């Protein structure tokens, strides 16, 4: 039974090492969510600092890949940072070679191709991570593209990742079934973040303080993460209506 | 058991069995003793023969005018490591016009042995080394294990029955450390130390091997009738 140790086919035509890498994805027990506004793309993720000895400012699963591209990771932090460093290098090389900023979907494809190679070549293991890339692309507008250990990737209207992804997914599905549009019809990114948090609260059934969340926002020509105080202002507005 | 096929595999309790098996080869090897004062450092080694027609396998190797070691375990591995030390001592002299510090020599041996314990295909070294030397901070004695662990000591012993000599040195600590400016008395203490590890056999003229280095003493090895004085 060495067909379960390396990335070769089982008799059923399955790659068990890829399937087990998917399971490593939920090892952090963190849920992430991504939605699109008119002018922005918002990504939120649960933040859990279990140890009091930790410096909470260094605990993060959201990465600034380029000026325009942000990435949130679902999976263990070593693989997350491996992917982050590579994505940063790829985005920088792309700009140098081709004279313009790497698009979100192109980077997603590139990282997905790298992931595919690990599923075919034996000496390389898959990374136990799911990578969600976000930007406001200059051609396609607000963009969400997600990569997994199988080498699969696709664009999204919105998405969710983690142990309770299904609950968040259905919650989002039901909202877009009402509105009948592919995005959050809202002008400011502040209100799109408020939407993202509100719908995560509803789906998970848990309240959040300023230190329980982590937020990333993509606008035209820059991606940035929110501070604890920026999130607090967001939480206050939610409670006041 | 299932985790001793190669050096690249931890056991469930966090042990490296191939390294531990290499450590076992040292215990099978013949006893050798090391000890020092503030002025001199001494190696004493019990050499082993195959039979009565055979010679007694050499245990002590010179690395530089101010440094050398004694071996216990696989002799070819000691040749490889001593050759590396010779080169590093030599690189220090030719490039920096500087005699290689004994402590730094230990750090280099540690790092060389370590690479063999973390990589596939290779094997750990199957030998333990006792390095003595005299540098700018005085006399020194090092114990090298092929796990990579190098330890600076006042005195020690490795090989079969080495525990007897090590206990003796642990008692004599306060005495032999004070033997300054007297090479013969320091060797006597080493010969008396290695004697605590003997059974059935005793120290003969072609059995015993002694080395010394010090303040105004280059690393020199004594064999044959040159050690009859100490028998």
């Amino acid at each position: 039974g060495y067909d379960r140790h390396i990335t070769i086919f089982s008799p059923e035509g399955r790659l068990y090492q890829v399937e087990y890498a998917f399971k490593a994805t939920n090892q952090t027990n963190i849920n992430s969510l991504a939605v699109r506004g008119k002018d922005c793309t918002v990504v939120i993720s649960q933040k859990k600092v279990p140890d009091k000895l930790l410096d909470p400012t260094t605990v993060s699963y959201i990465f600034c890949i380029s000026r325009t591209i942000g990435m949130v990771v679902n999976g263990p932090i070593p693989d997350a940072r491996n992917a982050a460093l590579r994505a940063k290098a790829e985005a920088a090389e792309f700009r140098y070679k081709y004279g313009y900023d790497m698009p979100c979907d192109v980077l997603a494809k590139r990282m997905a191709n790298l992931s595919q190679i690990y599923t075919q070549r034996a000496y390389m293991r898959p990374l136990g991570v799911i990578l969600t890339f976000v930007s406001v692309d200059e051609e396609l507008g607000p963009s969400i593209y997600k990569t997994d250990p199988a080498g699969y990737y696709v664009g999204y209207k919105a998405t969710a990742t983690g142990p309770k992804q299904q609950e968040i997914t259905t919650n989002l599905e039901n909202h877009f079934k009402k509105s009948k549009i592919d995005h959050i019809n809202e002008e400011s990114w502040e209100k799109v973040v408020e939407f993202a948090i509100t719908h995560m609260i509803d789906a998970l059934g848990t309240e959040f303080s300023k230190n329980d969340l982590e937020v990333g926002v993509a606008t035209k020509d820059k991606f940035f993460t929110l501070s604890a105080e920026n999130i607090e202002e967001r939480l206050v507005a939610i409670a006041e209506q | 058991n299932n985790y001793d096929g190669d050096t690249v595999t931890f056991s469930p309790t966090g042990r490296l069995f191939q390294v531990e098996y290499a450590l076992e080869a040292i215990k099978q090897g013949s006893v050798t003793v090391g000890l020092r004062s503030n002025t001199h450092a001494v190696l004493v080694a019990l050499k082993r023969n195959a039979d009565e027609l055979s010679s007694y396998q050499k245990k002590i190797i010179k690395c530089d005018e101010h440094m050398g070691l004694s071996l216990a375990g696989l002799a070819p591995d000691a040749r490889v490591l001593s050759n590396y030390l010779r080169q590093q001592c030599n690189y220090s002299s030719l490039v920096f016009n500087r005699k290689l510090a004994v402590e730094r020599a230990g750090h280099l041996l540690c790092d060389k042995a370590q690479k063999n314990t973390q990589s596939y295909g290779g094997r750990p070294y199957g030998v333990g080394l006792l390095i003595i030397g005299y540098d700018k901070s005085g006399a020194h004695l090092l114990e090298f294990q092929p796990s990579g662990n190098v330890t600076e000591l006042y005195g020690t012993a490795i090989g079969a029955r080495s525990q007897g000599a090590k206990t003796y040195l642990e008692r004599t600590l306060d005495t032999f450390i004070k033997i300054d400016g007297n090479p013969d008395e320091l060797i006597k203490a080493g010969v008396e130390a290695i004697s605590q590890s003997l059974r059935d056999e005793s120290l003969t003229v072609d059995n015993l091997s002694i080395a010394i280095v010090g303040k105004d003493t280059p690393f020199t090895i004594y064999d044959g009738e040159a050690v009859a004085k100490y028998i």
């Binding site: 595919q116 070549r121 000496y123 080498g151 998405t159 997914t169 877009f176 592919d182 | -």
Partner: protein, 250 residues
Amino acid sequence: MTDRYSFSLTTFSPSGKLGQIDYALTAVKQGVTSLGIKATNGVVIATEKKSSSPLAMSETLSKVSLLTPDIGAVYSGMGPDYRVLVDKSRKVAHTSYKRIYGEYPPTKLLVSEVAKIMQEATQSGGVRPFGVSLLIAGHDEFNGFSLYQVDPSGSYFPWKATAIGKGSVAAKTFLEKRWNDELELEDAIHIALLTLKESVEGEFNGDTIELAIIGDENPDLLGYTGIPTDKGPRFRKLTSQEINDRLEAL
């Protein structure tokens, strides 16, 4: 590090079977149905856009891909394996042909190059075979229209019409009854839509179906005018609207 897997991972068993190839074919069997039909004046390739989530934008995922202006491809099996094969197939069409002869390769020779790549994954060290079967439709001046199947082993066969994946056995039977040597392209598209409906469970419309043709030259899709000999690509992907129009006459 270094890739230390310099030995074959696909080997002959006592019965003469190459296990990893057989298993790759099993992965293809599980995959979504895709098909290809050759007409007198064109070829049609089609498949279902099996969307993994309704939140996912299935337009961004392209199962039917342009390889050259006159050659297109569709698959059944593992999507990521297909995606990288399309990247390699597009590049090899340039490096091993266009940069030498100054023109795009004929269908059969591009197929041959793709087949070679898949064969090498079946014999080279430290790799598994590709978990896809390809259907490559194309046109060239001296061979006319053609349709090829390529399997994980690297074997390739020319077809008048065929199907691969989930409901291939039923679909190939359906095609045998409907195919003849006098079909026009529109008739082939009609048969493709009929055949594909049998294997689809849920929604059946332009947004859930991906369909492309190799047909007449499209000068409107060339992007420039001024060179008479350059008349535009024969490959064209049908729009969501163009599919739905033909589903009313179904």
